[PDB]
Amino acid sequence: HMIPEEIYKILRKQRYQIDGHTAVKLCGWVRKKMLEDKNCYKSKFYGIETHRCIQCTPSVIWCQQNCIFCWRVSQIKEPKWEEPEVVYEKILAMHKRIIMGYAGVLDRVGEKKFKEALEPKHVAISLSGEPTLYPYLDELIKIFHKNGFTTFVVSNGILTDVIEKIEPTQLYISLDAYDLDSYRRICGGKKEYWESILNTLDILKEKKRTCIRTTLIRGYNDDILKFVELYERADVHFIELKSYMHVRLKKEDMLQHDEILKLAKMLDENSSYKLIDDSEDSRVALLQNENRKINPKL
Numbered sequence: 653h654m655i656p657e658e659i660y661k662i663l664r665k666q667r668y669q670i671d672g673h674t675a676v677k678l679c680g681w682v683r684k685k686m687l688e689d690k691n692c693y694k695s696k697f698y699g700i701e702t703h704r705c706i707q708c709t710p711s712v713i714w715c716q717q718n719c720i721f722c723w724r725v726s727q728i729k730e731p732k733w734e735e736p737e738v739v740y741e742k743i744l745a746m747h748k749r750i751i752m753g754y755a756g757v758l759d760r761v762g763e764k765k766f767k768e769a770l771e772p773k774h775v776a777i778s779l780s781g782e783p784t785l786y787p788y789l790d791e792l793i794k795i796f797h798k799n800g801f802t803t804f805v806v807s808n809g810i811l812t813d814v815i816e817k818i819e820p821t822q823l824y825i826s827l828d829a830y831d832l833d834s835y836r837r838i839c840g841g842k843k844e845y846w847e848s849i850l851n852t853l854d855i856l857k858e859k860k861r862t863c864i865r866t867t868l869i870r871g872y873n874d875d876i877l878k879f880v881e882l883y884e885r886a887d888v889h890f891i892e893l894k895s896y897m898h899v900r901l902k903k904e905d906m907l908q909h910d911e912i913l914k915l916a917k918m919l920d921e922n923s924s925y926k927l928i929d930d931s932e933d934s935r936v937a938l939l940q941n942e943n944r945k946i947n948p949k950l
C-alpha cells in the first residue's frame with residue numbers, strides 16, 4: 653500500500669478520507685456553516701461560499717519540511733503518483749461522501765444548503781503535505797478549472813519550477829520564517845530549501861494572483877519587521893498574518909487577535925502592504941499591496 657498502515661489508521665482517526673496518496677477532510681468551518689450558518693474568514697475576505705469548499709491534498713504525507721507546528725499526532729517512500737484525472741475524481745468522490753454525512757440531520761441543515769454543499773464551487777489544495785510534490789499538480793488544477801471550480805493552492809514554495817508553471821485562482825506561499833536560522837528553527841528544512849524559497853519569492857510577481865500567509869508563533873517568528881524585506885521582494889497581491897492555532901507547542905504560544913492586529917498595523921506602517929480586513933474568529937489580518945491593488949473578492 654502507499655501509506656503505512658499505522659499512518660493510515662491515525663489519519664482515519666483524524667477524520668481524513670484517504671484514497672491512494674490523495675486525501676480530503678471536511679474543514680471545521682463547513683460544519684459551522686452547515687449547522688450554524690457561520691462563515692469562514694475566506695468567505696469574509698474573498699467571497700467564497702464556506703459550505704461549497706473542498707479541502708484536499710494530492711500528497712497527503714509527503715513534504716520536504718518538518719515544521720514545529722506540523723504532525724502533532726521522514727522515511728516513507730514516495731508513491732507511484734496517479735494520473736490527474738483519477739486524483740480529481742477521487743477528490744470529488746471523497747468530498748461527496750463527507751457531505752452525505754449530513755443527510756441524517758437534514759432538518760438541522762436545510763435542503764437548500766445540503767443541495768449546495770453537494771455541488772462544491774471551490775477547492776482548497778491545502779490539507780496536508782506539499783502539493784507541488786505531486787508531479788501532475790498543474791494538470792490537476794487545469795481539470796478543476798475546466799469543471800468550474802476555483803482553486804486555492806498552499807505551497808511551501810521550495811519547488812520554484814512548479815510555482816512558475818501553475819496558475820490557481822489564488823496561489824498561497826507559506827512564509828513562516830525570515831532567515832536561515834528561523835527557517836531551520838520553525839520549518840526544520842535544509843539551507844538549500846530556504847535558498848530555493850527565496851528564488852520563488854523573486855517570481856511571484858509573475859503570477860496572476862498571489863498571497864503570502866505567515867503563521868505567527870509567540871517568541872519564534874513574531875518580530876514582524878524582520879519579514880518586511882522578504883514581503884517587498886515577493887511583491888504579492890495580499891498577505892495573511894495568522895496566529896498559530898494550538899492543537900510540541902503550548903496554547904500560550906498563540907497570539908491574541910489584538911496582537912495580530914498590532915503586528916499587521918506595524919507591517920502597514922513599514923511596508924507597501926496596507927491593512928484592509930481581519931477576522932477575530934480565525935485570528936487573521938488581510939493586507940493588500942498598495943502598488944498591485946486587485947479586488948479581494950473573487
Ligand code: SF4
Pocket residue numbers: 679680681682692693694695700702703705706707776
Ligand atoms: S476556504 Fe479554507 S477556511 Fe474556508 S472552508 Fe475552505 S478550507 Fe475552510
